[PDB]
Tab-separated table of C-alpha atoms and ligand atoms in Angstrom:
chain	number	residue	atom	x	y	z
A	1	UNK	CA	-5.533	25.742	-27.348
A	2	UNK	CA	-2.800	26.451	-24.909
A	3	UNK	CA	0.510	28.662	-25.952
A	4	UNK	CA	3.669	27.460	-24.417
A	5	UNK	CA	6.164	29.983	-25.361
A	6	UNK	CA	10.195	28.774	-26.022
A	7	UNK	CA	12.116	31.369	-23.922
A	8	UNK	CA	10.705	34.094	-22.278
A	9	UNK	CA	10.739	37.355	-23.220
A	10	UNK	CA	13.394	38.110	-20.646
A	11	UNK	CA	15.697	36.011	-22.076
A	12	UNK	CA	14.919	32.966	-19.313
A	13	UNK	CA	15.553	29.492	-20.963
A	14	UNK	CA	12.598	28.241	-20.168
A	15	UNK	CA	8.618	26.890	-21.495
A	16	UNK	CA	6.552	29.645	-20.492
A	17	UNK	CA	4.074	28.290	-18.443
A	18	UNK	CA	6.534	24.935	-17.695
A	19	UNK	CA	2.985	23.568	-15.895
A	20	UNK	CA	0.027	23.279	-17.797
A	21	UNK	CA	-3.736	21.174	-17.699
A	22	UNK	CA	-4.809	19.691	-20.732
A	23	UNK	CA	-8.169	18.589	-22.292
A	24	UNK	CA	-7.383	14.900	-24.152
A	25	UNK	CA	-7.637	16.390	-28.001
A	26	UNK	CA	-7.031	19.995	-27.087
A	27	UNK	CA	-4.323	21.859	-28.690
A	28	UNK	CA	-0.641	23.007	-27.456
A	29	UNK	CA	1.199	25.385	-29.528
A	30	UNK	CA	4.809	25.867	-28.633
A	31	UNK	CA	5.911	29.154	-30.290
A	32	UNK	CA	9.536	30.111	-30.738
A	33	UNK	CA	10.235	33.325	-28.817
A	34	UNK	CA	13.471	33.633	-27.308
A	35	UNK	CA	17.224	32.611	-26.790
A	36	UNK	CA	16.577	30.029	-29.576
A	37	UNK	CA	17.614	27.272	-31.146
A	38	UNK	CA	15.333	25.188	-28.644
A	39	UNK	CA	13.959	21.793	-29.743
A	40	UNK	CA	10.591	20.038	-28.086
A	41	UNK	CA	11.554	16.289	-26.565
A	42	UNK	CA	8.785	14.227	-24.428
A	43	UNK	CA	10.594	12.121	-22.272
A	44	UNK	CA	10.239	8.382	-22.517
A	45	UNK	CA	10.594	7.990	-18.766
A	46	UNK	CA	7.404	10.119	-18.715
A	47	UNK	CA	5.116	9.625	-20.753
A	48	UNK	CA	1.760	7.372	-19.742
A	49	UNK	CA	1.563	3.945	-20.955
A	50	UNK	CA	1.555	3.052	-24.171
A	51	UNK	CA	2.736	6.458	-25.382
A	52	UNK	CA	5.717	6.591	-28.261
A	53	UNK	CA	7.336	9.823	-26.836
A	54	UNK	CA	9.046	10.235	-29.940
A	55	UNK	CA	6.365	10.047	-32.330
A	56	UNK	CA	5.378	13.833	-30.511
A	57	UNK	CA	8.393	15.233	-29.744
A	58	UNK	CA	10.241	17.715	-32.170
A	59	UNK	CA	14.270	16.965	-32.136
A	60	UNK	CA	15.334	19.097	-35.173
A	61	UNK	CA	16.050	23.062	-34.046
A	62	UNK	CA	13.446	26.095	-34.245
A	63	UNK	CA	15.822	28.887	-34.958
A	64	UNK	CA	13.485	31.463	-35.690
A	65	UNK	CA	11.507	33.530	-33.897
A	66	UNK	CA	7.775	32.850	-34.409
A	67	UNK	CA	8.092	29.003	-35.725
A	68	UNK	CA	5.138	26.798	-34.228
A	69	UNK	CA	4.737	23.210	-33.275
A	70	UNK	CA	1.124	21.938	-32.677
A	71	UNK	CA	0.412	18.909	-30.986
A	72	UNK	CA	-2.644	17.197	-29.726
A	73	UNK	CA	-2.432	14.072	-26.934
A	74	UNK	CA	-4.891	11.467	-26.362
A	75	UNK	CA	-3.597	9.697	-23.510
A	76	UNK	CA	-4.588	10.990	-20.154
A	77	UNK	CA	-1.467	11.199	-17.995
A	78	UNK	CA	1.486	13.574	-16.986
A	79	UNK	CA	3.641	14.063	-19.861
A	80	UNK	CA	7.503	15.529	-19.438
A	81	UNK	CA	9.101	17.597	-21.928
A	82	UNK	CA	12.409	19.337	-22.037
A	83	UNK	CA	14.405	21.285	-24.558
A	84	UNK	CA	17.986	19.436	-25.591
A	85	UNK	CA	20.241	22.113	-25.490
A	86	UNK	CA	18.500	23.955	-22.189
A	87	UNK	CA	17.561	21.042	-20.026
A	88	UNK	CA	20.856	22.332	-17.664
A	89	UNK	CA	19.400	25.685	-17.360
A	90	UNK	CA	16.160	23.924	-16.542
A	91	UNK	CA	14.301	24.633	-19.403
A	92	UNK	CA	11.880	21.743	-18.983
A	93	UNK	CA	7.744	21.466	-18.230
A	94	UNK	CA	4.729	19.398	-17.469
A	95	UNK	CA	1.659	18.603	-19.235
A	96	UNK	CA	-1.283	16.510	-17.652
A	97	UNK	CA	-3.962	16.026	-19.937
A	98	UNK	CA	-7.173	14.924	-18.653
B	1	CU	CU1	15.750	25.504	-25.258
């Protein structure tokens, strides 16, 4: 499992890591931990072949602090992901699973 918090603690709008290495199956929880509402969107520009980026992303709001979102990718590839309301502030990240 790999934690990617929502916010950091400081109050940056960002996935904390925003870079992270992947096994195929292995599990990312994103946890809701600061300046939320945040939501979890994979980009279909960047997702690997064959991927349906919005079959894993998360579009409704997490608006409280704690709330987790567990998801598990099969694909190997580089994977984007970025928060609607925060991707100005550059609250985005990276996933490669291998
Ligand atoms: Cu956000």
């Amino acid at each position: 499992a790999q934690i990617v918090k929502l916010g950091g603690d400081d109050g940056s709008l960002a996935f904390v890591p925003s870079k992270i290495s992947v096994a195929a199956g292995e599990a990312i929880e994103f946890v809701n931990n600061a300046g939320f509402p945040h939501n979890i969107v994979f980009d279909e520009d960047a997702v690997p072949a064959g991927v349906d980026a919005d079959a894993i992303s998360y579009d409704d709001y997490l608006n409280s602090k704690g709330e987790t979102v567990v998801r598990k990718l099969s694909t190997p590839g580089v994977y984007g992901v970025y928060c609607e309301p925060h991707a100005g502030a550059g609250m985005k990240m990276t996933i490669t699973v291998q």
